[PDB]
Amino acid sequence: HHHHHHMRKIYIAGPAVFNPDMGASYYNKVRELLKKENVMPLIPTDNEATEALDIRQKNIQMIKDCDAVIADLSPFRGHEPDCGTAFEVGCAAALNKMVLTFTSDRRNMREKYGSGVDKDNLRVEGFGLPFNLMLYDGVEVFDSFESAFKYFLANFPS
Amino acid sequence: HHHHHHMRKIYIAGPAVFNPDMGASYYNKVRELLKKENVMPLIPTDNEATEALDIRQKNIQMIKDCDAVIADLSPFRGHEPDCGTAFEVGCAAALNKMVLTFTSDRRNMREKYGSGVDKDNLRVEGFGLPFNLMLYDGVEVFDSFESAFKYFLANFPS
Ligand SMILES: Cn1c(=O)ccc2ccccc21
Ligand SMILES: Cn1c(=O)ccc2ccccc21
């Protein structure tokens, strides 16, 4: 009776932070969706510090503390995902965390670039994946935050 | 007495793999530089597999095996570093590996973009750093592979 109960936690990785509203609209939708399932969002801008290294360390700690990462690997400033988000996905992988990814554009890299090379003749990967192969770990690439969250609920029960 | 001797190893992270020559010219220079100090380069294309997941897993294992990562965070397809490289830097950070970075362009992000926002009004970070703040851990951002390697030799002796 009255045993400790773990509250599930998801790190909310993605470039929403660079939106004009600093991600408010995105994060508010995330907060509302997760609240219904008693899941805590760990959001990059929470209790934000002023120094770069402190912001970084707090985000790494959120990844260490999380049960899963849901990462927005949508195109950012071109066809490639955000590198900060990629760093966080790498952190999560090394820590053996559940990593779930989605993107607004699921086409293969070569379809995105329209060729096996970019405008500067640099090679575009040909593995039938929507982004750099380091970012794919065998879990389905989802089409939305919500679809990724459904996988979380099915595969990480309370 | 013939005790075991550790050979130092550096993971060679960066988008050279996408050069037309698949990074041969870059990796050859790395090999020659490291050979002089009896340091082993762990190069992403070594013993390369055919399946994406296998290539990824082998690269993660190289990061686990390394003493340091030297990461080329130069602009790739714009002002941002390569996301694969960023993933690898995050992997190394989570594993408490020495991470050393360089770039061909050390200007602050806002200098690179010429503004506090990009062409689509998305926020450009203002922390006096050359790239996404997750990629900076307090070690100097070097100007070349060689300068990073000099730091390695000074700070990770045989
Ligand atoms: C601006 N900013 C934040 O305000 C919070 C987290 C964060 C992480 C990576 C890059 C930039 C970030
Ligand atoms: C094409 N390719 C390789 O051939 C080898 C490693 C690797 C790592 C990330 C992304 C692409 C890669």
Side-chain angles (χ1 to χ4, degrees), chain A residues 60-82:
Chain A
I60 292 172
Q61 191 60 58
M62 287 183 208
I63 298 170
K64 289 177 175 185
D65 295 348
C66 81
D67 295 307
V69 175
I70 293 177
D72 182 358
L73 295 180
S74 294
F76 182 70
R77 301 189 166 140
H79 297 299
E80 311 280 319
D82 168 47

Side-chain angles (χ1 to χ4, degrees), chain A residues 80 108-111 113 115-118 122-136, chain B residues 17-18 52 55 76-77 82-85 88:
Chain A
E80 311 280 319
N108 300 335
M109 294 194 68
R110 287 181 176 180
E111 296 173 308
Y113 284 88
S115 174
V117 298
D118 71 12
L122 307 178
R123 296 170 60 81
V124 177
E125 291 176 31
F127 293 89
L129 289 170
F131 38 60
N132 191 293
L133 65 83
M134 299 302 301
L135 298 171
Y136 177 74
Chain B
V17 63
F18 307 118
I55 297 166
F76 181 67
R77 301 187 166 144
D82 167 47
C83 66
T85 305
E88 290 147 12

Side-chain angles (χ1 to χ4, degrees), chain A residues 102-109 111-112 128-130 141-144:
Chain A
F102 74 95
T103 172
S104 58
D105 189 353
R106 281 76 62 182
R107 294 179 299 160
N108 300 335
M109 294 194 68
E111 296 173 308
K112 289 174 171 163
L129 289 170
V141 179
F142 301 101
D143 302 349
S144 68

Side-chain angles (χ1 to χ4, degrees), chain B residues 1-156:
Chain B
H1 270 215
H2 299 102
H3 288 81
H4 172 261
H5 177 78
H6 173 68
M7 191 179 60
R8 293 171 297 178
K9 303 176 180 65
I10 301 173
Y11 180 68
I12 309 303
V17 63
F18 307 118
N19 293 338
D21 70 352
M22 315 191 72
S25 63
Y26 180 76
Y27 296 137
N28 284 337
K29 289 176 181 177
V30 168
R31 287 173 187 283
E32 192 174 321
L33 188 68
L34 270 52
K35 183 71 173 186
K36 294 168 185 170
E37 311 297 331
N38 195 46
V39 177
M40 170 94 105
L42 304 176
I43 283 160
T45 54
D46 272 37
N47 301 109
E48 193 179 317
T50 56
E51 291 181 334
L53 289 171
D54 290 338
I55 297 166
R56 173 177 180 278
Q57 187 54 41
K58 287 291 186 178
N59 274 264
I60 291 170
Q61 191 60 57
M62 287 181 207
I63 297 169
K64 291 177 173 186
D65 295 346
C66 80
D67 296 305
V69 176
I70 292 172
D72 184 357
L73 293 181
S74 292
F76 181 67
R77 301 187 166 144
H79 296 298
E80 311 279 319
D82 167 47
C83 66
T85 305
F87 171 100
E88 290 147 12
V89 169
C91 194
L95 299 168
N96 301 317
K97 299 289 180 175
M98 175 175 293
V99 177
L100 313 174
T101 69
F102 74 96
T103 171
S104 55
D105 189 355
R106 282 75 64 182
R107 293 180 298 162
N108 302 336
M109 294 194 72
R110 285 179 177 180
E111 291 172 313
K112 291 175 169 162
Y113 285 89
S115 172
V117 300
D118 71 14
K119 67 180 182 62
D120 302 305
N121 201 31
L122 307 180
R123 296 168 64 256
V124 179
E125 294 176 27
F127 293 88
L129 289 168
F131 37 60
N132 191 293
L133 66 85
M134 298 305 297
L135 301 172
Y136 177 71
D137 73 359
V139 175
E140 180 180 12
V141 179
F142 302 101
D143 301 347
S144 66
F145 184 93
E146 290 71 27
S147 50
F149 185 52
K150 289 197 179 194
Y151 182 98
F152 175 86
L153 295 173
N155 291 279
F156 208 110

Side-chain angles (χ1 to χ4, degrees), chain A residues 17-18 44-45 48 55 59 88, chain B residues 123 125 127 132-134:
Chain A
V17 62
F18 309 116
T45 55
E48 195 178 317
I55 296 167
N59 275 261
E88 291 149 10
Chain B
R123 296 168 64 256
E125 294 176 27
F127 293 88
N132 191 293
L133 66 85
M134 298 305 297

